[PDB]
């Protein structure tokens, strides 16, 4: 859920901000230490098929 919450505000600022909101400018909109972005955005992504 907390991940999705970032995937949300990521879109509003997409074309509005030019390219997109900087990796450190999201969680300001959230309520949390702002560091969570790195770890959360890292562990999340599904592993690549070893057969790729």
């Amino acid at each position: 859920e907390t991940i999705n919450k970032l995937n949300r505000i990521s879109r509003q600022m997409l074309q509005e901000m030019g390219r997109e909101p900087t990796p450190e400018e999201l969680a300001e909109r959230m309520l949390m230490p702002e560091d969570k972005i790195r770890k959360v955005l890292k562990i999340a992504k599904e592993p690549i098929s070893m057969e790729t």
Binding site: R11, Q12, L14, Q15, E16, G18, E20, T22, P23, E24, R38, L41, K42, M50
Partner: protein, 1340 residues
């Protein structure tokens, strides 16, 4: 003539005058994308059309519509050059105005509110360089033009192999530009079948029923009528005399009291003529003749009200007597013949399972989507959405055109969806073909072959983006509220972004430009491919499509095509070839009206060229241009033979118009076999640039057009004088006649300096002009790598001798003297880009700090405080370019190391050395260093140093520009003031900035003064921005990957001369590998004592037939001769007279060659310079088929005081004694392929291994072991070396214990093996046993 053509001139042999000169070679690449991205007023292909296709998008019935206004491309984020450094994509923002209308429910249609959102950015799109290239990540890339089967109808045969019968078959296929394929095919029983795509076969008529056609109607479409009349009693028949043809009389043919035909008497043209002129409209027939005839429409009894006979049913003497008593007089029957008009459709109906429209739609829906229950709305929606949907289907323009054209229609343009008449007509044509009228086209023919390019494909991708986003729009508009949203929240970025980014990023068509070489780039950009999406595959297509087709003339190069897995699936674009308006290929020709061969050019496509009679580029016409001979060689329809004097409509434009830009660079090509010619034109693109770009000694005349049309050189935009010349930049003062009124201006060309190419070679421009020299509009200002004075130099000429030298030249291997390695002529420069990654792990962040555990002071010296190598510091393999360290906790040692560390007092570091070392064996000089820091991470010391340095350098570089430009402008103003205002001495006295405040008498000169100032301030303010932005882009942290804190890119420049093992060849396809480097002492010399550079093998020449490689040697010899002569006269400083005389002599050469030479040139300051550049040799042009001749070469030889034989006595540098018989010596242009041994050589002892299967794998670019294949195993089997094999596949590779247990014994001096079981088989044991299979090892 021209300007830089004064510094040198190539002697051009050959007779045929150029009727049309070579166009821009990069034409296709640029034009295409120029069409893709553009604002097009109409639906012509472009982003516009792509938009207008899917747009507007409305909600499902929801009466909320989203339409499209207009789009724009904002200025690129980074320029071409910056983006090449940073490594981003060179791309422009796509800003599109969208409109969201909400219709008030309960129409008339009018909107409550339409919010027109401003331009919403969806994705950025790649841009094309002036050189026709794209930059994806800091790398120039090219999109290869695709060639495929053009949309339309296609009638094939497929005889022979099918069914073994020999009755053949006939198939038709309607292939659109997008959507499902419609196939119609026969079978041995002559039943017409139809299939969508490759799907399940169905009886043809079943499609027609889905189109709302009853049996009666189908029969009305494909069959004529035979009218029967029951008048009086006992049936009669209407008769057309042409009907009886191809048949013998079945009964007495008689009427009008005259018997025309009897029984058993076939009806010939005689009976037909008789019956024709006699005008017999009716004949009486027996009641038994209709026993076989098939009724056309239905029939019913007026009384009984029951169906007497269904449509399409065989009549009998019974049924006839049933419907004839009912009162029926007329009966319609199909006109059928098993020869002339075939009854195929009728028999098709008999196989048709369906009856009405609904049943057909059902049987179809249960075909396309088999097994799921069919529904009315389903079977309807499907069929309508297949060929009739404006959305899911189209043939485009090319498709509709070829379609109608192959159907013998009129209109060349129409709708993109099929019509009832379309499909039905196609069926009719297939039927006609089976009936014997009409031919079948072929796929290989270039008329059925289309050619796309970058633009089209880019458009297709952006289109897929638009549809995948369309689904989103219609999705959101389902539940949407009124004014709460806007055409922003709906449309995303990624759908477009990743869609186009995917294409340019990964496609078999999109690829890194092959840049080792100007010809390489330019021949890459002109290339065609039948591969990729939409095309076939290597394993798919056979030899047919690969083979050179007669239509490839003037369009495709018959010689230059890759030899390998894909042959003829690529080829190359011909020199003069052009993409047809529709996208076929068209080639230049010369229109011949009456008896004169006109110089008027004409562009004919593959189909256009067909019936015309085309003469030959090699033909003889004199004066007014009448064909000399009464019989001239010409090709007309597919074939070639001798044609009458004036039967011709056309003649070839040029001699070289058959070949390609690469194949045109081969001298004496007419003397080379096509095999080795292919090899040559293929290898010429593999030529690595040299350190000293030399010149072709033996040319063609394309060498200019290539280097010029390619971006490697830098051409002048305008003519004038050079204000400034530097190895860095070149500043030209623009001539007034050209230069625009406002802003004045002087063209400033910034030259590219030493930098990395895509091939890891070196690309560096050099000024070819001096300070204050006159230049011409469109002249070469500065050369590129491997380019000399506008001419393309892919290598260096040199003294060559053919003779076996003590076996050192044994195979195609080449033996070269030391004079070549000494002069560093064949030396090449390489630029390698190495990178250091500072990442982040859960254990801790990585540091680039210079503080490295376990390193010497010699290692620490070469680095600065920050741990980065100094610019200019020369390094070798193993040196530390960039220091790096990664945290590793708890060393976790054993008692031996516990005691060891206890005694020697060594604290085990918590960090492991991650530093980026120089690759082992390579050595070079560090030219450039880059640092990309994550945004938000503090910039290190070296980072700040680099940043500030770039800041000052940018300040100087931009300020200098402002200064030169301003001085140039003020000079123009000062020039205007003296006209009408004149004070010369009195003007420049006061401050320059004050000049602006001055006026002038009423005139247009007062306006130009206004202009000069008006533009002045522009350039004055345009500085600010150009500074500010330039500053900011240095400061901002470049975006990086997840986990990486910063990245250090080091650029290394290695210099490699040449060594044994390198591959080098000539342009004639004679390969070779330098074997030994021989001392000048041992080198065979001549009576003059001049040693020969290279000694080849004469044995390679006869078998591989390229005799051109000899001619190039001969002519070259003579050519160099003419150099030496001049070099003598210049060393003896004769005068401007003798030189002019000799030079004039050389530029004529016997009789009849188009040349046009000097005595116009300035008697001293010009000619004397030309000779000066000619002392190195006399450059000679030998056009492809128009090239030089024996006697001409021999005569030039006489002019050089060289022998006619081209052979001079030689002497061994060892014994000094003469060599029996002469030897051919001369000058041959020799390239150097990039295949240098330094890259090729590899070795490994024990390296890193693979995790999944334990097998040797290179981690460090320490190359994993060589592969031992099944054949390589069979060899050991045959030999019977058992242990060699065992160790080969066990202990040296796959055995996890074996390897180490071996290594130990290896160092111990004991050669043995304790093999055990390979991990491959063990893994297989586990894999098999994982299933319900129990596999065990037994016994003992």
């Amino acid at each position: 003539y021209s300007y830089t053509e004064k510094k040198r001139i190539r002697k051009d042999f050959g007779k045929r005058p150029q009727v049309l000169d070579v166009p821009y070679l990069l034409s296709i690449q640029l034009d295409s994308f120029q069409k893709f991205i553009e604002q097009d007023p109409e639906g012509q292909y472009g982003l516009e059309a792509a938009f207008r296709s899917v747009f507007p998008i409305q909600s499902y019935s929801g009466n909320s519509e989203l339409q499209y206004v207009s789009y724009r491309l904002g200025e690129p984020v980074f320029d071409v050059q910056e983006c090449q450094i940073r490594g981003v994509t060179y791309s422009a923002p796509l800003r599109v105005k969208l409109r969201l209308v909400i219709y008030e429910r309960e129409a008339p249609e009018g909107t409550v509110k339409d919010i027109k959102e401003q331009e919403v950015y969806m994705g950025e799109i790649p841009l094309m360089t002036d050189n026709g290239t794209f930059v994806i990540n800091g790398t120039e890339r090219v999109i290869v033009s695709q060639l495929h089967r053009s949309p339309g109808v296609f009638f094939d045969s497929d005889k022979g192999k099918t069914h073994s019968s020999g009755k053949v078959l006939y198939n038709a296929r309607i292939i659109p530009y997008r959507g499902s394929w419609l196939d119609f095919e026969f079978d041995p029983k002559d039943n017409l079948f139809v299939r969508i795509d490759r799907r399940r076969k169905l009886p043809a008529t079943i499609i027609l029923r889905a189109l709302n056609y009853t049996t009666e109607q189908i029969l009305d479409l494909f069959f004529e009528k035979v009218i029967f009349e029951i008048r009086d009693n006992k049936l009669q028949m209407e008769l057309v005399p042409e009907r009886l043809r191809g048949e013998t009389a079945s009964f007495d043919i008689e009427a009008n009291g005259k018997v025309y035909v009897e029984k058993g008497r076939r009806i010939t043209a005689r009976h037909i003529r008789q019956l024709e002129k006699d005008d017999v409209k009716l004949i009486e027939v027996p009641v038994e003749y209709i026993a076989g005839k098939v009724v056309a429409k239905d029939y019913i009894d007026e009384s009984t009200g029951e169906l007497i006979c269904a449509a399409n049913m065989e009549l009998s003497l019974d049924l006839l007597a049933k419907l004839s008593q009912s009162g029926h007089k007329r009966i319609e029957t199909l006109f059928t013949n098993d020869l002339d008009h075939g009854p195929y459709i009728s028999e098709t109906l008999r196989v048709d399972p369906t009856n009405d429209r609904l049943s057909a739609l059902v049987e179809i829906y249960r075909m396309m989507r088999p097994g799921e229950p069919p529904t009315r709305e389903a079977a309807e929606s499907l069929f309508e959405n297949l060929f009739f949907s404006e959305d899911r289907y189209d043939l485009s323009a090319v498709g509709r055109m070829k379609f109608n054209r192959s159907l013998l229609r009129e209109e060349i343009e129409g709708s993109g969806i099929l019509s009832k008449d379309d499909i039905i007509d196609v069926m009719k044509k297939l039927i006609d073909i089976r009936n014997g009228k009409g031919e079948v086209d072929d796929i290989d023919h270039l008329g059925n072959r289309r050619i796309r390019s970058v633009g089209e494909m880019a458009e297709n991708q952006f289109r897929v983006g638009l549809v995948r986003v369309e689904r989103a729009v219609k999705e959101r508009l389902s539940l949407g509220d009124l004014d709460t949203l806007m055409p922003q929240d709906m449309i995303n970025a990624k759908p477009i972004s990743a869609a186009v980014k995917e294409f340019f990023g990964s496609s078999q068509l999109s690829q890194f430009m092959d840049q080792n070489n100007p010809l390489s780039e330019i021949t890459h950009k002109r290339r065609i491919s039948a591969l990729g999406p939409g095309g076939l595959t290597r394993e798919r297509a056979g030899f047919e499509v690969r083979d050179v087709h007669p239509t490839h003339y003037g369009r495709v190069c018959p010689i230059e095509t890759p030899e390998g897995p894909n042959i003829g699936l690529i080829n190359s674009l011909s020199v003069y070839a052009q993409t047809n308006e529709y996208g076929f290929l068209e080639t230049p020709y010369r229109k011949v009206t009456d008896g004169v061969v006109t110089d008027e050019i004409h562009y004919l496509s593959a189909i256009e060229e067909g019936n015309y009679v085309i003469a030959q580029a090699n033909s003889n016409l004199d004066e007014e241009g009448h064909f000399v001979e009464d019989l001239v060689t010409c090709r007309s329809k597919g074939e070639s033979s001798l044609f009458s004097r004036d039967q011709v409509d056309y003649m070839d434009v040029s001699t070289q118009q058959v070949v390609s830009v690469g194949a045109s660079l081969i001298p004496f090509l007419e003397h080379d076999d096509a095999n080795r010619a292919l090899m040559g034109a293929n290898m010429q693109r593999q030529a690595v640039p040299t350190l000293r770009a030399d010149k072709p000694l033996v040319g063609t005349g394309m060498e200019r057009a290539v280097a010029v049309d390619s971006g490697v050189t830098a051409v002048a935009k305008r003519g004038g004088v050079v204000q400034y010349v530097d190895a860095s930049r070149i500043v030209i003062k623009v001539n007034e006649d050209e230069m625009y009124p406002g802003e004045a201006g002087i063209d400033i060309y910034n030259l590219t300096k030493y930098t990395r190419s895509n091939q890891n070679t070196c690309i560096n421009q050099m000024p070819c002009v001096s300070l204050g020299e006159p230049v011409e509009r469109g002249d070469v200002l500065a050369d590129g790598p491997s380019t000399d004075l506008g001419e393309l130099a892919l290598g260096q000429n040199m003294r060559v001798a053919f003779m076996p030298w003590n076996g050192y030249n044994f195979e195609d291997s080449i033996l070269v003297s030391e004079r070549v390695v000494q002069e560093d002529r064949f030396t090449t420069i390489h630029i390698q880009e190495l990178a250091c990654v500072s990442r982040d792990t859960k254990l801790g962040p990585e540091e680039i700090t210079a503080d490295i555990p376990n390193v010497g002071e010699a290692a620490l010296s070469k680095l600065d405080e920050s741990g980065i190598v100094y610019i200019g510091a020369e390094v070798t393999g193993g040196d530390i370019l960039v220091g790096k360290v990664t945290p590793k906790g708890e060393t976790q040692l054993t008692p031996e190391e516990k005691l060891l560390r206890a005694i020697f007092g060594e604290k085990a570091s918590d960090v492991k050395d991650s530093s980026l070392r120089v690759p082992n064996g390579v050595s070079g000089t560090v030219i450039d260093v880059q640092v990309f820091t994550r945004d938000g991470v503090e910039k290190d010391k070296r980072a700040l140093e680099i940043e500030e340095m770039q800041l000052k350098q940018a300040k100087k570089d931009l300020s200098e520009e402002l200064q030169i430009l301003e001085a140039g402008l003020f000079s123009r103003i000062r020039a205007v003031l003296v006209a009408g205002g004149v004070e010369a001495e009195k003007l420049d006295k006061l401050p320059r900035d004050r000049w602006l405040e001055l006026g002038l008498t009423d005139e247009e000169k007062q306006n130009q003064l206004e202009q000069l100032a008006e533009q002045y301030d522009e350039l004055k303010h345009e500085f600010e921005k150009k500074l500010e932005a330039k500053r900011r882009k240095i400061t901002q942290g470049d975006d990086l990957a997840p986990g990486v804190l910063k990245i250090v890119k080091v650029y290394l420049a290695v210099k490699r001369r040449i060594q044994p093992g390198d591959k080098m060849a000539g342009r004639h396809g004679n390969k070779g590998v330098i074997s030994k480097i021989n001392p000048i002492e041992d080198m065979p010399y001549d009576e003059n004592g001049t040693p020969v550079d290279i000694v080849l093998n004469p044995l390679g020449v006869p078998s591989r037939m390229n005799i051109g490689q000899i001619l190039e040697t001969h002519l070259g010899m003579a050519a160099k001769g003419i150099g030496d002569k001049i070099n003598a006269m210049l060393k003896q400083q004769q005068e401007v007279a003798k030189l002019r005389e000799f030079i004039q002599r050389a530029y004529d050469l016997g009789a009849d060659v188009r040349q046009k030479v000097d005595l116009s040139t300035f008697s001293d300051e010009e000619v004397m310079r030309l000779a000066e550049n000619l002392r190195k040799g006399m450059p000679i042009a030998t056009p492809v088929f128009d090239g030089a001749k024996e006697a001409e070469i021999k005569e030039l030889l006489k002019l050089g005081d060289l022998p006619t034989s081209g052979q001079i006595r030689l002497y061994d540098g060892r014994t000094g004694e003469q060599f029996e018989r002469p030897v051919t010596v001369g000058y041959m242009y020799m390239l150097k392929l990039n295949h240098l041994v330094d890259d090729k050589m590899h070795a490994r002892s024990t390296g890193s291994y693979s995790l999944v299967t334990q097998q040797p794998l290179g981690g460090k670019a320490q190359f994993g072991g060589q592969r031992f294949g099944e054949m390589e195993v069979w060899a050991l089997e045959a030999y019977g070396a058992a242990y060699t094999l065992q160790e080969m596949l066990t202990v040296k590779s796959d055995d996890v214990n074996g390897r180490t247990k071996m290594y130990k014994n290896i160092v111990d001096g004991n050669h043995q093996m304790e093999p055990g079981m390979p991990e491959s088989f063990n893994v297989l044991l586990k894999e098999i046993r994982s299933l319900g299979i129990n596999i065990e090892l037994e016994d003992e």
